[PDB]
Design a protein around this ligand. Structure first.
Ligand code: FMN
Ligand code: GWV
Length: 353
């Protein structure tokens, strides 16, 4: 049956209710950047070296000082219990099995504590939204620290929600038995136009600024990664504020439509930070060769969003494990066929635009 990431999406479309599949699939507006996140990878061509001895390929690397089995990590995707009853618990168990890390959404259908209990040995990070209520925001950070999470990925591209047309058409909301489990009140738990757009407008602070990054940097000694940066000047500002990484992201093409593909902006950002912090990528990673191209252009690791959700939709924990194993094996093969024994030898001469 399912032997590549595209097969998992096709299966997910066949089993999920329309409103759920559309929520997960959609980009903003006419979905120009959604298509380009994928198309852009195809424009970057590979220039493989032959005869390098690839009998012993080592995929391991490190993200913010923590070892991982491969440069392929799970990105934050909200509300995973819509895809499968075990949701984020399934995801974290699969990450533990694989030896990779999970970035947990602030809008998860499982709590910070529940996910740490299901994956005590898993490498786990918190994706943070800055809520108008700074006490809510502080509580999330404190829980993450108490529960053994190793970094904060602060989302900086979402002062408001992007306009995802199908969610407005479907009047997207959570199924009746589910909530955003990090919150106590009806409104902040998203108790069931787009419901989610209205939730953001009520809960999330559109005023946030670099001053808020200064606040967050004072709040926690955890490593902090700015997630959603697309400009070199903003990446330099993040470094100036004492942040510890940049996740080059257009939010899965769900925020501002018509921004570049992340693989296309990656080189400018890598150049801008001058080696001072790790740079990561997400957006459009579906194949081992996508991972290889991102590393050749300077990314330390990539994050996957939608493929994880499609794994859940097929078979819960087993489906997420399968998706991650597919990506791992495609990446090993790509490294081998390119002449790369390890991630340290994946260099810029492997790619040209
Ligand atoms: C269904 C879905 C839900 C998402 N939820 C969140 C979220 O809660 N927090 C966040 O910072 N980003 C969120 N994102 C953005 C993802 O972290 C990531 O940037 C994106 O999924 C990467 O692109 P990909 O799906 O092509 O792999 C979401 C993306 C999707 C598709
Ligand atoms: C690997 C596991 C997820 N089983 C499904 C499966 C996935 C990929 C492949 N290969 C040979 C391309 C074979 C089988």
């Amino acid at each position: 049956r399912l032997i590549c990431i595209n097969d998992y999406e096709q299966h997910a479309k066949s089993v999920l209710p329309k409103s759920i599949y559309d929520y997960y699939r959609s980009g903003a507006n006419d979905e120009e950047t959604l298509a380009d996140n994928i198309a852009a990878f195809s424009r970057w061509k590979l220039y493989p070296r032959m005869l390098r001895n690839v009998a012993e390929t080592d995929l391991s690397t490190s993200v913010l000082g923590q070892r991982v089995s491969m440069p392929i990590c799970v990105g934050a995707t909200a509300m995973q219990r819509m895809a499968h009853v075990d949701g984020e618990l399934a995801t974290v168990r699969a990450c533990q099995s694989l030896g990779t890390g999970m970035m947990l959404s602030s809008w998860a259908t499982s709590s910070i504590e529940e996910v740490a209990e299901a994956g005590p040995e898993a490498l786990r990070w918190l994706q943070l939204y800055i809520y108008k209520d700074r006490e809510v925001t502080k509580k999330l950070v404190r829980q993450a620290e108490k529960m053994g999470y190793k970094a904060i990925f602060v989302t900086v591209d979402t002062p408001y929600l992007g306009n995802r047309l199908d969610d407005v058409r479907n009047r997207f909301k959570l199924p009746p038995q589910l909530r955003m489990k990090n919150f106590e009140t009806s409104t902040l738990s998203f108790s069931p136009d787009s419901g989610l757009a209205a939730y953001v407008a009520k809960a999330i602070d559109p005023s946030i600024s670099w001053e808020d990054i200064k606040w967050l940097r004072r709040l926690t000694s955890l490593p902090i990664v700015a997630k959603g940066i697309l400009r070199g000047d903003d990446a330099r500002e993040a470094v100036k504020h004492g942040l510890n990484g940049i996740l080059v992201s257009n939010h899965g093409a769900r925020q501002l439509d018509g921004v570049p593909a992340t693989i296309d902006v990656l080189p400018e950002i890598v150049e801008a930070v001058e080696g001072k912090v790790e740079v990561f990528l997400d957006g459009g990673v579906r194949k081992g060769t996508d991972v290889l191209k991102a590393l050749a252009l300077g990314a330390k690791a990539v994050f996957v969003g939608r493929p994880i959700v499609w794994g859940l939709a097929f078979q819960g924990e087993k489906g997420v494990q399968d998706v991650l194993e597919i990506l791992k094996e495609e990446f090993r093969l790509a490294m081998a066929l390119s002449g790369c024994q390890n991630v340290k030898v994946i260099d810029k001469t492997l790619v040209r635009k």
